[PDB]
Symmetry: C3
Subunit: 304 residues, 3 copies
């Protein structure tokens, strides 16, 4: 908590704590860490430090990337399977989280419950990096979604952002959508009216649209999301199954200097034949997170 930019020791719990000078740095780290790997430069950076993974939701992208990330800088990772943990013996979450805070130097916690994370973070001898909460924050996702947006399109400022799919529940879209307000972008929606109020305050446009087929011609980023059939309209359900879907047939009325993103997981929303399409940056999105974590973990531990 000193001069220059530095998170050294800082917890990483909400996206509110990031600045633009920090993120650009945070991005400048990732490219540099990436490029070391691309050429095979030794990374004894977090050699000897340890990361404690704690995930109570079901994931295999955040955690994996986090695992690859830690393992790439030289560090090690504590598999924590709650299923096979002393929780099957009645122990507090803090009790565990702190216990693990004894054997590790950072923490990566992911909990669905409303703010089980804030709590566990609150008192911790060691730092905690959010990966999910019940309140919907996901700074690492939001964080990585930017590099994609910046890398993919040259700059961030000016872009118009079509966020598509079920957004109400959407816990990733509150993380990015809000943070996007550090840039000059027009937000389109295809959403929780409660925290839509913070965004529009700072002038960040906000307009609702019928489907992709209409909102797409002025689109610089097509941010997609899993819907969930179960929990939809009611009897009727049908077209909204098909509308908020990106087939390769839709993608023909889409800008050519544009990129479509997905946090993932997905199922049938983005048509499998949309895989092989340069404008398809949803898989590279997954790849680039690994470097935010290396960009983050490494910094959050003072080794960069």
């Amino acid at each position: 908590s000193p001069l220059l930019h530095s998170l050294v020791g800082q917890h990483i719990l909400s996206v509110q704590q990031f600045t633009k000078d920090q993120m650009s740095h945070l991005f400048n780290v990732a490219h540099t860490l990436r490029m070391m790997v691309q050429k095979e430069r030794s990374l004894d950076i977090l050699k000897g430090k340890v990361m404690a993974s704690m995930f109570y939701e079901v994931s295999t992208r955040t955690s994996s990337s986090f695992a690859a990330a830690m393992a790439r800088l030289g560090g090690a990772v504590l598999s924590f399977s709650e299923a096979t943990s002393s929780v099957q013996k009645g122990e507090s979450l803090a009790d565990s989280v702190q216990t693990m805070s004894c054997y590790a130097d950072v923490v990566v916690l992911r909990h669905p419950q409303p703010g089980a994370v804030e709590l566990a973070a609150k008192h911790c001898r060691r730092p905690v990096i959010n990966a999910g909460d019940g309140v919907g924050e996901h700074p690492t996702q939001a964080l990585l979604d930017i590099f994609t947006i910046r890398e993919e399109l040259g700059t961030v400022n000016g872009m118009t952002i079509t966020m598509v799919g079920d957004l109400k529940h959407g816990r990733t879209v509150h993380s990015l959508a809000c943070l996007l307000t550090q840039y000059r972008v027009s937000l389109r929606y295809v959403m929780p009216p409660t925290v839509r109020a913070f965004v529009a305050s700072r002038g960040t446009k906000q307009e609702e649209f019928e489907s992709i087929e209409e909102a797409l011609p002025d689109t610089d980023v097509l941010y997609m999301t899993r819907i969930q059939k179960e929990r939809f309209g009611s009897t009727q359900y049908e077209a909204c199954f098909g509308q908020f879907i990106l087939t390769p047939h839709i993608m023909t009325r889409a800008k050519k200097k544009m990129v479509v993103m997905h946090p993932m997981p997905r199922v049938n929303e983005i048509s499998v034949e949309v895989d092989s399409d340069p404008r398809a940056a949803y898989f590279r999105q997954a790849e680039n997170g690994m470097y935010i974590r290396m960009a983050l973990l490494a910094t959050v531990l003072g080794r960069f």
Copy 2:
């Protein structure tokens, strides 16, 4: 002083010259980490983790420990193992003995561990059995006791909670007999009067007490334990063998309270430099580094 290759199955096999060394290793390994010195000690060697009880303190520490000296660890999940195709425990344990250089096995069954250990091309470090030992726990409980209070000899030790089932308390309570300490016991009428014949034989004083509120004024270590109201057949049993921060005011100031963990409602959460149960957990990691490293000949 050397266990190189030795199995680590019961607490009976430790000497005082060994443990002091075993402790002198831990501090030295600790202090390397505190400064950030490279530890290519068990670089290359591999540890095979095999746990059939539900834990996340012994195994984790063990994981951190191995990972810190440079080694790697085999995540062995029986759930996803050929057990679901159904093969012998030895079969597996030996199989894993093909891919690793040590082993850390934890089994509830009476002497599933002794067996698996018995025949093994590679060494096995106990972490729990049915019959009913836990040398690494006992081992680490000492450094806490020694580190926390200056010396081990002279201390009076209040072990509180359900002790009958207690598989950690038979590991330390016995071993404590290598020192000059007065053992006190606090239990719901329901310590196993089987293993107890051995400790008091050697004059390691042993006396029963009503609760903490009586046995605490002459207490150097308050060793706490999870009850298990799953054999109550008694909310005084609940609330008596409990350490609130309000009880802690009639407790010595040159004293420390320990817990192997896990816990639930027995110790009030609540900001007491006398609270060495979390640092207890931290200090195990270094027994394992102190042990694993030695048990593998790299120190």
Copy 3:
């Protein structure tokens, strides 16, 4: 093989395997003397197993960890389980190889098919298990001096047998007499090609087929379709009518087919078999990643 997928045993040559073996010994002997192996330092392996195992994956884990690499513990149970490809490719973002094991007919071929990164089979529904077959050879070669000339008694339930179709076929790169021991219930499907390249004969039990046996390859049965269980069993009492210059193997797991008191027997190479896989993976992984 640099970049090559490893999906069926059809893609191996004898000059490749012998190299593939010459690597394993060399990698082994570095470990025996404790030589540093920064070989796959910085690369990452993504483990993806949908069957229940703890020998292939472990060996694979030890193997990767020994050359300096790291391993992605992928537990489908705690995973987004989205498409299998979706995942397999996703993991292909975070790793440099892949070790996939799927029971389904050709879930593996598929996932492999499109992958930015290489995939090393460990099991499929078609029954192909190149790493096992691969391994089973070094044992056969190491244990008996050479591979050519040996007569191979494969015993147990062979019909379902997914490991025996990996080795039995590949064995055809050598001059060996294949013998078979089964409960009347080997699949006469792949056998269209085994005897094409030239010996195969059926036998009543071990007690008859054993006197001209150089390798006694054993297998878990399936009480699920008695003498058919005690016959195709190797007690220590049977082992006395068995050649002295001969070795008995098992892919494992086992239960009661090989009598526990057959463990401590210098003709017993089924445990060393397990040990020697670790080095095919180091022999393979390392090569498959261009660091050797």
